[PDB]
Amino acid sequence: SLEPPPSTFQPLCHPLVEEVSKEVDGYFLQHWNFPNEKARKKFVAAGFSRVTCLYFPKALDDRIHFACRLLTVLFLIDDLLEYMSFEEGSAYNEKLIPISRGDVLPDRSIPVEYIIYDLWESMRAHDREMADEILEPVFLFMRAQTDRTRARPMGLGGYLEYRERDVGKELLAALMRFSMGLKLSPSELQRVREIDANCSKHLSVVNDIYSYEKELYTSILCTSVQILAQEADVTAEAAKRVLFVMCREWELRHQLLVARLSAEGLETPGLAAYVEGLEYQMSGNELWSQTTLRYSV
Amino acid sequence: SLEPPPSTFQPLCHPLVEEVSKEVDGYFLQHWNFPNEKARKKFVAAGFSRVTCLYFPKALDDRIHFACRLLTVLFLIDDLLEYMSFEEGSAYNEKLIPISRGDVLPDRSIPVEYIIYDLWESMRAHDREMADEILEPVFLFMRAQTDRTRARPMGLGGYLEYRERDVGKELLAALMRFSMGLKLSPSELQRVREIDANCSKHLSVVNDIYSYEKELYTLCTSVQILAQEADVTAEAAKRVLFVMCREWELRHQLLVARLSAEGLETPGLAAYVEGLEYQMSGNELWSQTTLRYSV
Amino acid sequence: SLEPPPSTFQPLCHPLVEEVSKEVDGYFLQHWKARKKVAAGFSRVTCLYFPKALDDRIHFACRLLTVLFLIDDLLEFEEGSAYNEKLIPISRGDVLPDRSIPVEYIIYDLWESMRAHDREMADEILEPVFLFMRAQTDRTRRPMGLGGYLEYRERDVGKELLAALMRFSMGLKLSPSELQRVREIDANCSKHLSVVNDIYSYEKELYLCTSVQILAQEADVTAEAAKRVLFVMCREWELRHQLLVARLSAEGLETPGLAAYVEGLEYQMSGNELWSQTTLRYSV
Amino acid sequence: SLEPPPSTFQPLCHPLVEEVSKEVDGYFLQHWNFPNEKARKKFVAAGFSRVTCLYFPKALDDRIHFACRLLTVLFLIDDLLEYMSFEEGSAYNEKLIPISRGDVLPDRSIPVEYIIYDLWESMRAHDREMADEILEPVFLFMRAQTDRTRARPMGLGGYLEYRERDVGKELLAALMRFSMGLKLSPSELQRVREIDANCSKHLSVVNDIYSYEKELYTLCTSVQILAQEADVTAEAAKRVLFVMCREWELRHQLLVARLSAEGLETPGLAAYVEGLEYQMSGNELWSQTTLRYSV
Ligand SMILES: C/C(=C\CC/C(C)=C/COP(=O)(O)OP(=O)(O)O)CCC=C(CF)CF
Ligand SMILES: C/C(=C\CC/C(C)=C/COP(=O)(O)OP(=O)(O)O)CCC=C(CF)CF
Ligand SMILES: C/C(=C\CC/C(C)=C/COP(=O)(O)OP(=O)(O)O)CCC=C(CF)CF
Ligand SMILES: [Cl-]
Ligand SMILES: [Mg+2]
């Protein structure tokens, strides 16, 4: 099989993983309109709350659950969208957006509508200012869930630059800041721009490495594995390995940029905690990619 | 510095290296026109025959000197071109091409001319049939020594496919077939087409990796390219490219076995495919030592 | 030899152009060589870009451009990012301008007058403007092919600054729900503006990143030859724009505000062309 | 539908077109094993010798038939290859090569085998020198008919650079020189490198413009690539590309004038570049009329 190269990074989980998993999972099991029982067992087996704790281990104890709820519903909605058309899904989420802003009261008879309205109302209660900060990142993501992918020849360079702007990863960085109470200033973010780009790249390639077998079932393939294999003319497996070393090079560069950021006296306490959180998203994303059933054939 | 990742390929120097060295080196130490003495000293150190012996280890004991000669003169000529222009250089070699075919005569007063003539007459003398096989390969190559790079940005893929056609690595393969008395038939060579590209690509990247510093002083190299596309330092890029070379090495082996499974292959190809394997490991050792890449 | 191919897009000019031009030019030419020329046609471009702008807002746009144009180039130590960055806080009004340095109180007053006419929409242009100003002062690049460049330009900031400034000029209120519906049309439009720009500014910018150089290399033809091919490509995007607008309408997603928005984008393209040809900024 | 933009070039056919066709047709009509009758009917419809007179309208009267025969057999062999695997076809043509060289006699009982042998035996008999001059161009093509295309992300520039090296266009140019009796020296050919690359792109793109739909059933053409990089329809890409083709026609005229103004144009090159012009004009008409692209 495939062996991951040496890494100075290691996966961690949020301390309250078990308590939150129970809480959040419980809520949805009683509120979410699940199809049959096999579905409820498939939901618990997924442990979305646990996935979230693996991504945001350094999240505040009284905030980690918000993230678990947020991602949980996003994962669920993403599954529903699978059985819908771009027109349907687009309209579906576009409706939940005003409900998320809290500018439209939900139809209490529809689960997803009040779960969303409630989740955001709850969030604004805990921290109005920061809760508003993640509104845009979330919608940007939601709208992207139903966007049509334009196919065009892309070399490794173009592909990687494209992933640097991935909205899913942008959502994770903004959600992580919320779960950690990190209110970074405009100057501080523009200060870690390279770090973010590098990280977003890491997360994506790691996903490509383990999601390849899945996507290669085409019964519109956009992945670094495919691109690196054709450009270097090697097998997909050969490309996966090469891509993995590249990822370690991005971990190194991360440490370099973090050292540079500090050496220049620009590492405020927040950025310190932030760039650390990012290190855990990278290691967390890797363990997840290696186990999640989403990538299972 | 840079630590090369594990390889199952091992270099090998041709046994007669030391003798063919004294021989060939001498031939040029009296015939070729060297400026002063410093030129000669350096020349000795460069050890072109040694370099050749590292690339063609399995070369027939009574043919290894030919190669050492062919590459010593090209290495020599190439060096002179660094002081000539695209018009001057293109003609310089363009003039030597006919004489090489034997269709023209070598002005005996002109070192380089009779050496090339004598060199070839000698080769057709040993093996007329094969001494010709490497006429075009050498020419197509000589003319390439004076071309002007075109203006089009290349990505990793474009650069690699481009290196799969490298005229130089093509010359090597041909000069090796000659040094090993391997008369491959057209149907065979094509059967190893992918094997030639994968190899040429391998030789070029290893070269890039060790020649980066040198070239960097003013660029078409896999190091700068991957460094820009992946957005990492040149060093990080070298490490990645090196691992990539190991994949090409593993691929080579597969291209070799696959060649026999779907129909075992003649001793010629079987031998040739092995010769290619030695150029790869040979080139690596060279790249790590040749002063050509030193500052 | 540059004979623009046929186009169905007809450029419009704001009827108050003459009025506002002298009005606006007469301003900076008081609060700012022996030359100063004008011949550039700043307020003139604005009027070609936003011909449907509201009569009482058209001068605002001319001022924001007459200043942004005197900055993009003109006054611009290849990292004088401190110059621009020192004008953002002022723009928001969080810092007062030294009545001595024109470029300062010009920005201040300018923005203060924009909020006073309409705060909401005035604040909305802030970010789009800063993003433009923050953009390009040198931070660019890796290997760029045609497709990469056009894709890069589909998300151009200046092109984003125009749509922003345009909505403010016409008093067009659009929700992200509606803007999201016109992403394709925006990307397409942004390309048209950038390539036309590249075609006529090739000489000036050459005195680099431009579709003219790239196509010339990839097709291996001269710059002028590339300009002609690029022009035909612009006519295709014009056709695509119409098709996209047709679709927006049929898909029942067209709303009055959106109907005006698209048509306005058409004006920027046609206007951008007429201008680029005449403007002595690229030495006609 | 698709209206071709203005052009200063015009298609031209060879005068002996009617006689050559008759001659070349009858020959194959009796020596070539046509499955039934439906085939012979189709065969005549193709007008292979008529296609040749369109591409080489300036061919010598006593040579144009050599071209028609050559293309006809290649066309036919291309069709039979469609019913063979890569390994099959590769071995099929790999056998006709040693035969074309005249090095191995044909099995007179197998049509394709003795039709090739005799053809080359004939050509050498008319101009041994030039005949051998085009052996490699033909073999380079034949071996490409059974090649596996390596798919990789490719932009416009990459695709065009690749087409400049198209073996088919190389064959037409080589075959054209043979048909026109133009023995170009190495210096002359090197002198028209750009011109050949420019023309090679032109023929290749015009083909793509008209073979798109055909290939658009259930991969590697300038149409799909430009449409995707510019985000326009394939139909629009075709209109843009056509204009580009006129630009290349312009480039051709300017390269000839410069090549002339620099005193580098010879009587042979003059006839050659004009021959390429008609190759571009002819290829365009063919692309619009051949049934090879229909449905
Ligand atoms: C992005 C996250 C939550 C967003 C909610 C959802 C449904 C994310 C899943 O969207 P994608 O995974 O990007 O499409 P994909 O499966 O890759 O073809 C946290 C981690 C999820 C990942 C999914 F890839 C990876 F980090
Ligand atoms: C195929 C030959 C040698 C193989 C060893 C190699 C890779 C020689 C390298 O030839 P170069 O194109 O100049 O790359 P470089 O920047 O000098 O390292 C013949 C020697 C030819 C020369 C001129 F081509 C001498 F450099
Ligand atoms: C270049 C030649 C003729 C010019 C007519 C042309 C442009 C034929 C081109 O047919 P293609 O659509 O390019 O598919 P191909 O890969 O060439 O089989 C002689 C080669 C003979 C053929 C017969 F099979 C090739 F098409
Ligand atoms: Cl030209
Ligand atoms: Mg500018």
Ligand SMILES: [Mg+2]
């Ligand atoms: Mg410009």
